[PDB]
Amino acid sequence: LKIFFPGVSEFGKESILFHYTDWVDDQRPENYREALGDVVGDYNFICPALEFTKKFSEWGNNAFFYYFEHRSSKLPWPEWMGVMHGYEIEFVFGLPLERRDQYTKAEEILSRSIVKRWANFAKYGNPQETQNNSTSWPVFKSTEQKYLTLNTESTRIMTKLRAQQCRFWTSFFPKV
Amino acid sequence: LKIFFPGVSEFGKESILFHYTDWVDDQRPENYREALGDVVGDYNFICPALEFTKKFSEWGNNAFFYYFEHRSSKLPWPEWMGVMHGYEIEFVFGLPLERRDQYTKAEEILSRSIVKRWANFAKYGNPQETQNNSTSWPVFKSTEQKYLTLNTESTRIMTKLRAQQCRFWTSFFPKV
Amino acid sequence: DIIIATKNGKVRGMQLTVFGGTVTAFLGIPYAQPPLGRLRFKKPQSLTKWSDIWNATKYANSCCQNIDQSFPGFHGSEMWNPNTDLSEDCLYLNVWIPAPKPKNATVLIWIYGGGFQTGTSSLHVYDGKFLARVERVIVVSMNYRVGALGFLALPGNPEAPGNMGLFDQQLALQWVQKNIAAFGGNPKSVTLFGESAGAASVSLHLLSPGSHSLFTRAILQSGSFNAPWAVTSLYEARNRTLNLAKLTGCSRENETEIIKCLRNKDPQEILLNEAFVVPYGTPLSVNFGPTVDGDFLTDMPDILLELGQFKKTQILVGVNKDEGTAFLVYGAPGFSKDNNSIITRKEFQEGLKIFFPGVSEFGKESILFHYTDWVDDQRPENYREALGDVVGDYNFICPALEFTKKFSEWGNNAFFYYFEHRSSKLPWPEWMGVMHGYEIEFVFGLPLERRDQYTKAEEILSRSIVKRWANFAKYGNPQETQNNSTSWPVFKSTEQKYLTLNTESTRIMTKLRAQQCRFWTSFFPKV
Numbered sequence: 001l002k003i004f005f006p007g008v009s010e011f012g013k014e015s016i017l018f019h020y021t022d023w024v025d026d027q028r029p030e031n032y033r034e035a036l037g038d039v040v041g042d043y044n045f046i047c048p049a050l051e052f053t054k055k056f057s058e059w060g061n062n063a064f065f066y067y068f069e070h071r072s073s074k075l076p077w078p079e080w081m082g083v084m085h086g087y088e089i090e091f092v093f094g095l096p097l098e099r100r101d102q103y104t105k106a107e108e109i110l111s112r113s114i115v116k117r118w119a120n121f122a123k124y125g126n127p128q129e130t131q132n133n134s135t136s137w138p139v140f141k142s143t144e145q146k147y148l149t150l151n152t153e154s155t156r157i158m159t160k161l162r163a164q165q166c167r168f169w170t171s172f173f174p175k176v
Numbered sequence: 177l178k179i180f181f182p183g184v185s186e187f188g189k190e191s192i193l194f195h196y197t198d199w200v201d202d203q204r205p206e207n208y209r210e211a212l213g214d215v216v217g218d219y220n221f222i223c224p225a226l227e228f229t230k231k232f233s234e235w236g237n238n239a240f241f242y243y244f245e246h247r248s249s250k251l252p253w254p255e256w257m258g259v260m261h262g263y264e265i266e267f268v269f270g271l272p273l274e275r276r277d278q279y280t281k282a283e284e285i286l287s288r289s290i291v292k293r294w295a296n297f298a299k300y301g302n303p304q305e306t307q308n309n310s311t312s313w314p315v316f317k318s319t320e321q322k323y324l325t326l327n328t329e330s331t332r333i334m335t336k337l338r339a340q341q342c343r344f345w346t347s348f349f350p351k352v
Numbered sequence: 353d354i355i356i357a358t359k360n361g362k363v364r365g366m367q368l369t370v371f372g373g374t375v376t377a378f379l380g381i382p383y384a385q386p387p388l389g390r391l392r393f394k395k396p397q398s399l400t401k402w403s404d405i406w407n408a409t410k411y412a413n414s415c416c417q418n419i420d421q422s423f424p425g426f427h428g429s430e431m432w433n434p435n436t437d438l439s440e441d442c443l444y445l446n447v448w449i450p451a452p453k454p455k456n457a458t459v460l461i462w463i464y465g466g467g468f469q470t471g472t473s474s475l476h477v478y479d480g481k482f483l484a485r486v487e488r489v490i491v492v493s494m495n496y497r498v499g500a501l502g503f504l505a506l507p508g509n510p511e512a513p514g515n516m517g518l519f520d521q522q523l524a525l526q527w528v529q530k531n532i533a534a535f536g537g538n539p540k541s542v543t544l545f546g547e548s549a550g551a552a553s554v555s556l557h558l559l560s561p562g563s564h565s566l567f568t569r570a571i572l573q574s575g576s577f578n579a580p581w582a583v584t585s586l587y588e589a590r591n592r593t594l595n596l597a598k599l600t601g602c603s604r605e606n607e608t609e610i611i612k613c614l615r616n617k618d619p620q621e622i623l624l625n626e627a628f629v630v631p632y633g634t635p636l637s638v639n640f641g642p643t644v645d646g647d648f649l650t651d652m653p654d655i656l657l658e659l660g661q662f663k664k665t666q667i668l669v670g671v672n673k674d675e676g677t678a679f680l681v682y683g684a685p686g687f688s689k690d691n692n693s694i695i696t697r698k699e700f701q702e703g704l705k706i707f708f709p710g711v712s713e714f715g716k717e718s719i720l721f722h723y724t725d726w727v728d729d730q731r732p733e734n735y736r737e738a739l740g741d742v743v744g745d746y747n748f749i750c751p752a753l754e755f756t757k758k759f760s761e762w763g764n765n766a767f768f769y770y771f772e773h774r775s776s777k778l779p780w781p782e783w784m785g786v787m788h789g790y791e792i793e794f795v796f797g798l799p800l801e802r803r804d805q806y807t808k809a810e811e812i813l814s815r816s817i818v819k820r821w822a823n824f825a826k827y828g829n830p831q832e833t834q835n836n837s838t839s840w841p842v843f844k845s846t847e848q849k850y851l852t853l854n855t856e857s858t859r860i861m862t863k864l865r866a867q868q869c870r871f872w873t874s875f876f877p878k879v
């Protein structure tokens with residue numbers, strides 16, 4: 001926390017530790033490894049993207065939020081780093097549509113779908129994949145905060161990503 | 177804080193200090209004297225009474241909440257202790273209706289009104305003073321949290337007493 | 353060196369250090385032909401075009417006007433008196449711009465009050481250099497003609513049509529439309545703001561077809577055109593124009609001759625006679641003000657308001673906690689700024705005669721009935737407090753609240769403030785409380801100057817108002833979004849939520865003076 005939160009009241013940092021280390025439970029050895037990464041990505045990316053989406057949508061425009069959960073079959077970084085920052089891009093750009101290329105079959109399908117949703121969004125303002133019985137992507141509203149999960153198995157509609165974490169980053173931390 | 181919050185993580189207590197000492201501004205010499213009392217009465221009385229009232233009312237019953245702001249003309253405790261715990265009782269019981277007794281005129285009127293509201297509540301479930309162009313006492317709802325202020329000058333309808341303080345006592349502190 | 357090219361010529365401004373930074377100020381830019389001689393009492397005539405550099409390096413002449421001589425040497429009163437020479441050649445304006453030159457800055461245009469009989473844009477409390485520095489808006493202010501010179505009316509007749517001084521403001525809003533891009537300003541984002549008669553002025557430009565496209569939003573501090581002092585009737589205006597003629601031996605039979613005669617008079621002769629054009633007036637008399645002229649104002653403005661005939665845009669509207677007090681030392685028996693002014697019932701009564709001259713007896717008993725049902729009859733400052741509430745509720749507070757309601761019923765967002773902070777530096781005594789006119793220095797940021805003996809809580813208070821005023825102007829929403837500030841709710845009929853402005857805690861409340869204004873608003877207009 002000292003690395004990532006340099007100045008950084010001591011109480012600021014205890015507060016991050018308090019929020020992120022109420023273990024369930026204190027047994028699991030990868031507890032603190034998993035907490036540091038969530039701290040970093042929730043503070044830096046996830047809550048600020050969710051807060052932008054809320055505020056933006058409160059002025060009346062349609063907004064769609066995704067949660068990307070697929071780890072590349074070809075990721076060179078180790079397993080513990082999971083679904084990393086930067087690693088949806090090759091799905092968005094379609095690199096897995098190139099079969100010459102050693103991605104799984106489920107990855108081609110996954111990327112074909114994202115490409116289609118990205119392109120429908122661009123042409124028509126609506127990120128639907130309309131042909132293949134795909135889960136329908138609901139608009140994101142304050143109040144419901146529905147988002148769509150992107151993964152090889154089943155995509156889901158869920159609500160209020162990191163509600164508890166981001167209440168922390170969003171209401172409390174800016175105060176310290 | 178050590179006196180009132182004995183065991184009492186150190187971080188618990190810093191958190192109270194953080195919440196209650198963001199001065200506006202750091203100039204005022206009675207800043208810390210005023211903060212300690214608010215800490216004590218918000219934690220011990222005010223937020224728990226407001227949370228009870230909310231939760232109770234969420235099940236459908238009419239609920240009325242008052243904020244008593246009048247300091248007795250006869251208070252023996254010093255001025256800085258202000259509108260103290262325990263000192264509405266003599267207004268509720270009508271002691272100021274006894275003129276023999278050295279309370280101001282505005283205090284007789286104030287107590288006559290409370291007596292009337294207390295008694296109408298008891299007989300009719302509605303704490304209104306209906307005859308003397310009195311401010312009407314709105315029910316307390318979650319959502320609006322309207323309450324009525326009781327004082328000699330003008331009674332008011334206000335909303336969300338100590339909203340910021342009690343978010344602290346109510347959501348956060350129980351965690352420490 | 354800082355020269356800006358305008359449609360009529362180049363103008364040179366001056367640099368100013370404010371808070372370790374710099375604002376450029378162009379004080380004294382002319383915006384119309386001087387309204388002298390043949391032009392006296394006429395609509396401002398557009399400005400000719402000058403080669404060479406006009407130097408805008410000091411404030412210009414203030415318009416001719418009577419001066420407050422009640423309290424010589426007293427800063428409370430004399431802070432409002434003019435501080436540049438009086439002259440009929442007073443049609444000038446001031447521009448303050450952030451340094452560096454902003455790219456497309458929001459514009460705040462100030463319109464001073466003074467009962468339409470007095471005032472000037474060059475007062476210290478109207479100095480927009482703090483706003484420019486702090487919020488990087490552009491501040492513009494203008495002098496416009498006051499008294500008979502600015503509002504004499506002989507309805508229909510262009511030699512003295514009425515409302516000239518509102519036309520002066522207008523022609524100034526025009527100069528901003530044509531000229532303010534040159535200065536880095538956005539003509540498409542202009543907010544008018546003004547206090548007292550200056551606020552009534554802002555509210556009539558909301559009603560004037562000719563002003564519709566010369567601004568975006570409006571702020572009205574302690575004033576609106578539905579206040580009882582704000583519009584002179586056609587009846588009264590004629591009486592007054594003829595009474596003026598009579599008093600200067602200018603009675604004629606050819607109204608065009610009355611005017612030619614009045615144009616031979618000299619400014620002092622005219623000024624000197626204004627106060628007596630009415631059999632009696634009050635400390636709140638507006639002898640020569642706005643009239644329905646069929647030009648600037650096309651119909652009684654109460655009718656325009658009721659029937660939704662005004663520019664559709666957001667408004668910010670406010671009043672101060674003790675509007676009425678300042679007037680009581682100008683003629684109410686037993687009042688004085690030099691003591692605590694505990695008056696008697698019979699004094700209260702004689703005071704209603706002061707403020708409510710004609711004035712059915714029953715009208716006045718009705719005010720007494722409404723305002724003297726004591727709770728309770730014990731308190732010695734009871735009648736002192738009632739007279740001031742009477743005066744400020746009738747004259748400012750209820751008419752501002754009624755304007756806000758009616759305006760908002762047509763669909764626009766509206767925000768209402770209740771200003772409750774008394775200046776740590778107020779020279780007037782304590783009993784006069786939060787006085788009319790004393791929010792202005794907070795709005796203009798004078799308390800941001802620490803050199804200056806305001807408390808810390810006052811700096812913070814003014815920084816916040818500045819921020820809310822500026823967000824309103826740029827974005828139509830008077831929020832202070834960064835510092836966990838109370839959120840300012842829109843004002844709706846039905847709820848009538850308003851925000852309180854004070855050093856301790858700001859609140860959301862509802863239905864300011866509900867009981868008082870039911871009185872002024874439904875009942876009194878009947879008497």
Ligand SMILES: *[C@@H]1O[C@H](CO[C@H]2O[C@@H](C)[C@@H](O)[C@@H](O)[C@@H]2O)[C@@H](O[C@@H]2O[C@H](CO)[C@@H](O)[C@H](O)[C@H]2NC(C)=O)[C@H](O)[C@H]1NC(C)=O
Pocket residue numbers: 591595596598599628629630631632
């Ligand atoms: C409309 O004007 C007349 C004019 O009366 C005035 O004469 C002016 C030149 C000026 O000196 C002024 O002070 C003076 O009163 C008003 O008529 C007057 O009204 C009062 C009360 O009604 C009488 O006591 C005066 O004697 C009377 N004067 C004359 C010569 O008729 C009239 O009141 C006015 N209307 C209003 C009330 O504004």
Ligand SMILES: *[C@@H]1O[C@H](CO[C@H]2O[C@@H](C)[C@@H](O)[C@@H](O)[C@@H]2O)[C@@H](O[C@@H]2O[C@H](CO)[C@@H](O)[C@H](O)[C@H]2NC(C)=O)[C@H](O)[C@H]1NC(C)=O
Pocket residue numbers: 684685686687688690691692693694
């Ligand atoms: C508060 O002062 C007022 C104002 O009148 C006076 O101003 C004082 C400060 C003092 O210089 C005094 O001599 C001056 O006249 C007082 O009202 C006055 O009351 C006096 C007492 O007889 C009357 O003579 C006046 O008519 C009246 N003045 C007017 C024209 O309004 C007032 O009595 C005083 N009261 C206090 C101390 O509460």
Ligand SMILES: *[C@@H]1O[C@H](CO[C@H]2O[C@@H](C)[C@@H](O)[C@@H](O)[C@@H]2O)[C@@H](O)[C@H](O)[C@H]1NC(C)=O
Pocket residue numbers: 455456538540541542568825826827
């Ligand atoms: C400056 O911005 C211009 C428009 O900005 C305004 O839009 C208005 C409708 C109003 O809402 C204001 O409050 C906005 O700020 C734009 O058209 C101009 O071209 C811009 N000029 C520049 C940068 O030179």
Ligand SMILES: *[C@@H]1O[C@H](CO)[C@@H](O)[C@H](O)[C@H]1NC(C)=O
Pocket residue numbers: 109112113116129131132
């Ligand atoms: C739709 O379905 C076909 C066959 O089932 C498949 O080949 C293709 O990848 C799908 N298209 C999209 C847009 O996902």
Ligand SMILES: *[C@@H]1O[C@H](CO)[C@@H](O)[C@H](O)[C@H]1NC(C)=O
Pocket residue numbers: 285288289292305307308
């Ligand atoms: C109602 O009013 C009367 C007279 O104004 C007063 O004596 C009494 O105290 C009031 N009653 C109540 C219930 O407050």
Ligand SMILES: *[C@@H]1O[C@H](CO)[C@@H](O)[C@H](O)[C@H]1NC(C)=O
Pocket residue numbers: 407
């Ligand atoms: C304008 O001011 C500048 C000061 O440098 C100078 O050129 C000149 O004296 C002025 N022009 C006048 C006085 O008309």
Ligand SMILES: *[C@@H]1O[C@H](CO)[C@@H](O)[C@H](O)[C@H]1NC(C)=O
Pocket residue numbers: 606608609
């Ligand atoms: C009145 O005489 C004046 C002299 O200029 C003139 O303005 C006007 O035409 C005359 N009005 C009439 C027709 O009486």
Ligand SMILES: *[C@@H]1O[C@H](CO)[C@@H](O)[C@H](O)[C@H]1NC(C)=O
Pocket residue numbers: 812815816819832834835
């Ligand atoms: C916001 O907060 C800072 C520090 O607490 C303060 O210096 C500043 O005055 C505030 N800004 C506004 C717009 O009130």
Ligand SMILES: *P(=O)(O)N(CC)CC
Pocket residue numbers: 465466467468547548549550581635636638
């Ligand atoms: P304002 O301009 O101060 N004014 C309204 C008439 C009070 C005298």
Ligand SMILES: [Cl-]
Pocket residue numbers: 024025026027028
């Ligand atoms: Cl475990």
Ligand SMILES: [Cl-]
Pocket residue numbers: 133134135154155
């Ligand atoms: Cl799917």
Ligand SMILES: [Cl-]
Pocket residue numbers: 160161162163
């Ligand atoms: Cl989650």
Ligand SMILES: [Cl-]
Pocket residue numbers: 200201202203204808809
């Ligand atoms: Cl302080």
Ligand SMILES: [Cl-]
Pocket residue numbers: 309310311330331
């Ligand atoms: Cl009441």
Ligand SMILES: [Cl-]
Pocket residue numbers: 336337338339
């Ligand atoms: Cl509170």
Ligand SMILES: [Cl-]
Pocket residue numbers: 281282727728729730731
């Ligand atoms: Cl009393």
